[PDB]
Amino acid sequence: NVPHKSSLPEGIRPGTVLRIRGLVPPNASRFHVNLLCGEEQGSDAALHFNPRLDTSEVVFNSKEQGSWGREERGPGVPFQRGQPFEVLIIASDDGFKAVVGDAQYHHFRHRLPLARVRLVEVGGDVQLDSVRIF
Ligand SMILES: N[C@@H]1[C@@H](O)[C@@H](O)[C@@H](CO)O[C@H]1O
């Protein structure tokens, strides 16, 4: 892996599916997937998906003008150190649906306009095998 970025300079529309395949390293503490509204530093985050192995939670949030919004959490932690995982982030008209493995995990309703998303960035403690956008 590596702090991985995929620019989407022309944006995305409902019906776009982000498929991330990878592995949580043995001593991982946390990793994240951000759908950002620009390439500049401090850009708003339409979505911050943050599995935290250290605190056993998975947090969802948005970032606007530098401030994080209200945190949402899914049930438990469907990730485990030393194991492979597959996540689908689906963009629909009303939000992003997150699927982990074979289960629907959480539905995050849009906070910022989907039309503003211009970049996908994956970072933290994660071994990335592939990131596809369908
Ligand atoms: N430092 C973390 C950020 O990295 C982000 O995960 C936000 C999510 O709300 O929580 C903060 O406490």
Side-chain angles (χ1 to χ4, degrees):
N1 162 237
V2 66
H4 180 91
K5 318 243 221 116
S6 293
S7 347
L8 297 170
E10 296 303 333
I12 51 165
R13 292 114 45 49
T16 301
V17 179
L18 214 198
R19 181 164 78 199
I20 302 169
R21 271 158 183 192
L23 184 141
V24 183
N27 313 126
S29 103
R30 48 179 76 171
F31 68 100
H32 63 265
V33 178
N34 292 326
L35 288 190
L36 304 161
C37 303
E39 282 183 11
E40 319 82 28
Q41 279 243 274
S43 279
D44 293 349
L47 174 72
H48 173 69
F49 167 72
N50 186 210
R52 299 170 175 181
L53 287 299
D54 62 345
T55 50
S56 286
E57 55 189 351
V58 179
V59 179
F60 288 86
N61 211 342
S62 57
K63 198 228 280 186
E64 191 140 358
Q65 287 289 201
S67 296
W68 289 104
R70 138 154 280 82
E71 290 187 333
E72 296 188 10
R73 303 181 142 62
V77 199
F79 297 100
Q80 59 175 13
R81 298 165 162 130
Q83 317 271 322
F85 66 84
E86 173 180 68
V87 177
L88 288 190
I89 293 183
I90 302 133
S92 85
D93 324 79
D94 66 340
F96 293 106
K97 306 184 280 192
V99 173
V100 181
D102 224 25
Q104 149 101 38
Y105 183 72
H106 187 78
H107 179 253
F108 185 84
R109 125 131 261 111
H110 294 318
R111 275 165 198 203
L112 317 192
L114 208 223
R116 287 232 281 138
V117 173
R118 292 277 176 291
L119 167 82
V120 174
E121 159 196 292
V122 182
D125 308 331
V126 52
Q127 186 180 288
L128 217 53
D129 286 343
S130 54
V131 175
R132 285 329 141 66
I133 310 194
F134 298 124

mmCIF file of all heavy atoms in Angstrom, residues 30 32 48 50 52 59-62 68-71, ligand 1:
data_model
loop_
_atom_site.group_PDB
_atom_site.id
_atom_site.type_symbol
_atom_site.label_atom_id
_atom_site.label_comp_id
_atom_site.label_asym_id
_atom_site.label_seq_id
_atom_site.Cartn_x
_atom_site.Cartn_y
_atom_site.Cartn_z
ATOM 1 N N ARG A 30 -5.685 2.107 12.970
ATOM 2 C CA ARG A 30 -6.833 2.625 12.206
ATOM 3 C C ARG A 30 -6.507 3.064 10.780
ATOM 4 O O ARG A 30 -5.349 3.359 10.459
ATOM 5 C CB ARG A 30 -7.526 3.797 12.923
ATOM 6 C CG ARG A 30 -6.628 4.889 13.434
ATOM 7 C CD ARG A 30 -7.429 6.007 14.107
ATOM 8 N NE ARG A 30 -7.905 5.654 15.443
ATOM 9 C CZ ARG A 30 -8.472 6.523 16.276
ATOM 10 N NH1 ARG A 30 -8.630 7.789 15.895
ATOM 11 N NH2 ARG A 30 -8.866 6.141 17.488
ATOM 12 N N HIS A 32 -8.550 4.959 6.984
ATOM 13 C CA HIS A 32 -9.727 5.695 6.579
ATOM 14 C C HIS A 32 -9.843 5.819 5.077
ATOM 15 O O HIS A 32 -8.867 5.650 4.351
ATOM 16 C CB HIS A 32 -9.686 7.100 7.167
ATOM 17 C CG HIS A 32 -8.535 7.912 6.667
ATOM 18 N ND1 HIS A 32 -7.346 8.010 7.354
ATOM 19 C CD2 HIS A 32 -8.346 8.560 5.490
ATOM 20 C CE1 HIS A 32 -6.473 8.679 6.623
ATOM 21 N NE2 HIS A 32 -7.052 9.024 5.488
ATOM 22 N N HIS A 48 -16.021 10.638 5.450
ATOM 23 C CA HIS A 48 -14.832 10.130 6.140
ATOM 24 C C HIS A 48 -15.312 8.788 6.752
ATOM 25 O O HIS A 48 -16.197 8.764 7.611
ATOM 26 C CB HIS A 48 -14.387 11.109 7.247
ATOM 27 C CG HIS A 48 -13.268 10.601 8.114
ATOM 28 N ND1 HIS A 48 -11.984 10.423 7.650
ATOM 29 C CD2 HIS A 48 -13.234 10.300 9.439
ATOM 30 C CE1 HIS A 48 -11.206 10.036 8.649
ATOM 31 N NE2 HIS A 48 -11.938 9.956 9.742
ATOM 32 N N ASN A 50 -14.010 5.755 8.814
ATOM 33 C CA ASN A 50 -12.849 5.461 9.654
ATOM 34 C C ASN A 50 -12.857 4.234 10.590
ATOM 35 O O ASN A 50 -13.190 4.339 11.776
ATOM 36 C CB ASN A 50 -12.577 6.762 10.438
ATOM 37 C CG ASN A 50 -11.313 6.741 11.278
ATOM 38 O OD1 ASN A 50 -11.270 7.409 12.306
ATOM 39 N ND2 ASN A 50 -10.282 6.024 10.845
ATOM 40 N N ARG A 52 -11.684 1.929 13.254
ATOM 41 C CA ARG A 52 -10.683 2.096 14.321
ATOM 42 C C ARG A 52 -10.512 0.795 15.077
ATOM 43 O O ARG A 52 -11.347 0.446 15.913
ATOM 44 C CB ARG A 52 -11.120 3.180 15.318
ATOM 45 C CG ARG A 52 -11.293 4.542 14.691
ATOM 46 C CD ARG A 52 -11.955 5.522 15.621
ATOM 47 N NE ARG A 52 -11.978 6.843 15.011
ATOM 48 C CZ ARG A 52 -12.478 7.942 15.574
ATOM 49 N NH1 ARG A 52 -13.009 7.891 16.785
ATOM 50 N NH2 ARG A 52 -12.442 9.106 14.924
ATOM 51 N N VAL A 59 -16.246 4.831 12.525
ATOM 52 C CA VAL A 59 -16.857 6.143 12.529
ATOM 53 C C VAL A 59 -17.065 6.722 11.130
ATOM 54 O O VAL A 59 -16.248 6.523 10.235
ATOM 55 C CB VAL A 59 -15.994 7.122 13.391
ATOM 56 C CG1 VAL A 59 -16.597 8.512 13.393
ATOM 57 C CG2 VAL A 59 -15.921 6.621 14.804
ATOM 58 N N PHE A 60 -18.177 7.430 10.968
ATOM 59 C CA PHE A 60 -18.555 8.073 9.713
ATOM 60 C C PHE A 60 -18.741 9.557 10.018
ATOM 61 O O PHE A 60 -19.391 9.899 10.999
ATOM 62 C CB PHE A 60 -19.910 7.541 9.211
ATOM 63 C CG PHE A 60 -19.869 6.134 8.684
ATOM 64 C CD1 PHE A 60 -20.002 5.052 9.541
ATOM 65 C CD2 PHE A 60 -19.741 5.893 7.316
ATOM 66 C CE1 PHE A 60 -20.010 3.752 9.051
ATOM 67 C CE2 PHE A 60 -19.750 4.596 6.822
ATOM 68 C CZ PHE A 60 -19.884 3.522 7.696
ATOM 69 N N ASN A 61 -18.203 10.443 9.182
ATOM 70 C CA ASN A 61 -18.385 11.868 9.433
ATOM 71 C C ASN A 61 -18.094 12.646 8.176
ATOM 72 O O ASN A 61 -17.666 12.082 7.193
ATOM 73 C CB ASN A 61 -17.454 12.346 10.565
ATOM 74 C CG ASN A 61 -18.049 13.502 11.362
ATOM 75 O OD1 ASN A 61 -18.967 14.163 10.905
ATOM 76 N ND2 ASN A 61 -17.526 13.743 12.553
ATOM 77 N N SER A 62 -18.342 13.945 8.226
ATOM 78 C CA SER A 62 -18.069 14.848 7.116
ATOM 79 C C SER A 62 -17.213 15.973 7.701
ATOM 80 O O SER A 62 -17.146 16.143 8.920
ATOM 81 C CB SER A 62 -19.368 15.429 6.570
ATOM 82 O OG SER A 62 -20.070 16.083 7.607
ATOM 83 N N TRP A 68 -15.182 19.014 11.834
ATOM 84 C CA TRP A 68 -15.843 17.735 11.674
ATOM 85 C C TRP A 68 -17.272 17.917 12.135
ATOM 86 O O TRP A 68 -17.545 18.707 13.038
ATOM 87 C CB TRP A 68 -15.180 16.676 12.537
ATOM 88 C CG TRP A 68 -13.857 16.298 12.055
ATOM 89 C CD1 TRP A 68 -12.655 16.679 12.581
ATOM 90 C CD2 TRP A 68 -13.560 15.445 10.946
ATOM 91 N NE1 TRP A 68 -11.626 16.115 11.868
ATOM 92 C CE2 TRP A 68 -12.152 15.350 10.856
ATOM 93 C CE3 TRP A 68 -14.345 14.747 10.014
ATOM 94 C CZ2 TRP A 68 -11.508 14.585 9.871
ATOM 95 C CZ3 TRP A 68 -13.700 13.981 9.031
ATOM 96 C CH2 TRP A 68 -12.298 13.905 8.971
ATOM 97 N N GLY A 69 -18.187 17.182 11.522
ATOM 98 C CA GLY A 69 -19.575 17.286 11.920
ATOM 99 C C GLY A 69 -19.930 16.265 12.982
ATOM 100 O O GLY A 69 -19.075 15.814 13.740
ATOM 101 N N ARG A 70 -21.205 15.899 13.030
ATOM 102 C CA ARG A 70 -21.692 14.923 13.989
ATOM 103 C C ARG A 70 -21.298 13.508 13.556
ATOM 104 O O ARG A 70 -21.544 13.093 12.422
ATOM 105 C CB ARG A 70 -23.214 15.088 14.119
ATOM 106 C CG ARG A 70 -24.043 13.814 14.179
ATOM 107 C CD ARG A 70 -25.363 14.066 14.929
ATOM 108 N NE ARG A 70 -25.172 14.051 16.387
ATOM 109 C CZ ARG A 70 -24.721 15.078 17.117
ATOM 110 N NH1 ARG A 70 -24.401 16.239 16.538
ATOM 111 N NH2 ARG A 70 -24.570 14.941 18.433
ATOM 112 N N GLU A 71 -20.658 12.783 14.467
ATOM 113 C CA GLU A 71 -20.200 11.425 14.206
ATOM 114 C C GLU A 71 -21.339 10.409 14.206
ATOM 115 O O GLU A 71 -22.274 10.518 14.990
ATOM 116 C CB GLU A 71 -19.176 11.006 15.265
ATOM 117 C CG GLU A 71 -17.869 11.732 15.157
ATOM 118 C CD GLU A 71 -16.815 11.194 16.097
ATOM 119 O OE1 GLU A 71 -17.187 10.644 17.146
ATOM 120 O OE2 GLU A 71 -15.611 11.321 15.802
HETATM 121 N N1 LIG B 1 -8.949 12.889 14.979
HETATM 122 C C1 LIG B 1 -10.159 12.280 14.449
HETATM 123 C C2 LIG B 1 -10.284 12.490 12.921
HETATM 124 O O1 LIG B 1 -9.215 11.855 12.248
HETATM 125 C C3 LIG B 1 -11.603 11.897 12.415
HETATM 126 O O2 LIG B 1 -11.557 10.478 12.521
HETATM 127 C C4 LIG B 1 -12.779 12.453 13.232
HETATM 128 C C5 LIG B 1 -14.113 11.833 12.868
HETATM 129 O O3 LIG B 1 -15.167 12.562 13.464
HETATM 130 O O4 LIG B 1 -12.567 12.226 14.646
HETATM 131 C C6 LIG B 1 -11.383 12.892 15.117
HETATM 132 O O5 LIG B 1 -11.296 12.735 16.487
#
